[PDB]
Amino acid sequence: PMFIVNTNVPRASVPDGFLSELTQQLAQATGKPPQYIAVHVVPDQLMAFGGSSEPCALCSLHSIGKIGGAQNRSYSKLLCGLLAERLRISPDRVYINYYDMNAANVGWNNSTFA
Amino acid sequence: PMFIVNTNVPRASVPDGFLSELTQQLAQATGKPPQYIAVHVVPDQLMAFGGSSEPCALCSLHSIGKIGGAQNRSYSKLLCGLLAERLRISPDRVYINYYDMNAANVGWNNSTFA
Amino acid sequence: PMFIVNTNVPRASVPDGFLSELTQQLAQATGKPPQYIAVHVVPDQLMAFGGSSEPCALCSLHSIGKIGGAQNRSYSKLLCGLLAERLRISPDRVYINYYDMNAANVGWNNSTFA
Ligand SMILES: O=c1c(O)c(-c2cc(O)c(O)c(O)c2)oc2cc(O)cc(O)c12
Ligand SMILES: O=c1c(O)c(-c2cc(O)c(O)c(O)c2)oc2cc(O)cc(O)c12
Ligand SMILES: [Cl-]
Ligand SMILES: [Cl-]
Ligand SMILES: [Cl-]
Ligand SMILES: [Cl-]
Ligand SMILES: [Cl-]
Ligand SMILES: [Cl-]
Ligand SMILES: [Cl-]
Ligand SMILES: [Cl-]
Prior knowledge:
The structure is a homotrimer.
Chain A: E1 2-7, H1 18-30, E2 38-42, E3 46-49, E4 57-63, H2 69-87, E5 94-100, E6 106-108, E7 111-112
Parallel strand pairs in A: 1-2, 4-5
Antiparallel strand pairs in A: 1-4, 6-7
Helix pairs in contact in A: 1-2
The structure holds 3,5,7-trihydroxy-2-(3,4,5-trihydroxyphenyl)-4H-chromen-4-one (2 copies) and chloride ion (CL) (8 copies).
PDB class: isomerase
Keywords: tautomerase and cytokine, isomerase
Assembly: trimeric
């Protein structure tokens, strides 16, 4: 599984262990193998949310299954909570796009998961 | 909605107020309140379009609805026009991927829009 | 088509001609004219794969058609081989997400491919 967060928050404001904390919390939330969670944080971005350059975040979570109405609601509370706690981003300035991927459309280790 | 533009154009060539112009033009085009519009500009990128490193842009527009055949044609004229006018990117070196998102797959403010 | 690779590998470790080799190999693999191939390489990223910050890559290939079970398996072997040979990234630390785009959802040159 793969989680990307793009933010205008400066790199110095990303705390130590942020990638590690994301890895564990997403592995637990998705039930996917922790050793297989990919996380990508992109700070210092030129972005605006509602025309304002106050701290904001645009995110995506791609997973083969474990995507749905209730599960995405739980992911959003979890992820917004982390961005608020660690990056001081208000949850109403966070978008997270969820993608339920077909196994044939995720490549890894010279093949796909299909 | 969320609009991202990645370009090899240098940051200095992105004019001041470009994020706001994108926000206002997208709010009017999509009919969405500008408060709902997130914009992200990534300049100075290592990119090629058709093997050439002339100014180019790879973009994406995600929106819950307001995506379709005629609308995307209109968005593409609008967005290529802005990138041509403000970033001096030729429209034939611009790609824009459009995504009609399900409300259940867009996270915001600790929940989803579903 | 559009190919993006995000990696924590430093920019200095991206060899000359990497964008060109990706364009040529993707044109041949997808059967699309290289002229239609856009490539985007993002080095020096803050990323982890399984909690580890050893070299890894997160990639995406968007194409109008030429996406499917067998083709994506062939794409993944091809691309992982290139990232292993050129960027020294182990294939088991590479994710590639594949997207079959509808022509109506790809904007280019003030219109779409529909
Ligand atoms: O990321 C992975 C993944 O998602 C699961 C998976 C794939 C499917 O196609 C499913 O239907 C499913 O329930 C789980 O397999 C894996 C097996 C590995 O050894 C390593 C992985 O990283 C995955
Ligand atoms: O970005 C948003 C959005 O797209 C619309 C919306 C959602 C739907 O599910 C629709 O069907 C629709 O027509 C509009 O609601 C919102 C409400 C907010 O308070 C804030 C938002 O940012 C959105
Ligand atoms: Cl669910
Ligand atoms: Cl898919
Ligand atoms: Cl939206
Ligand atoms: Cl969706
Ligand atoms: Cl294409
Ligand atoms: Cl050379
Ligand atoms: Cl196929
Ligand atoms: Cl599509």
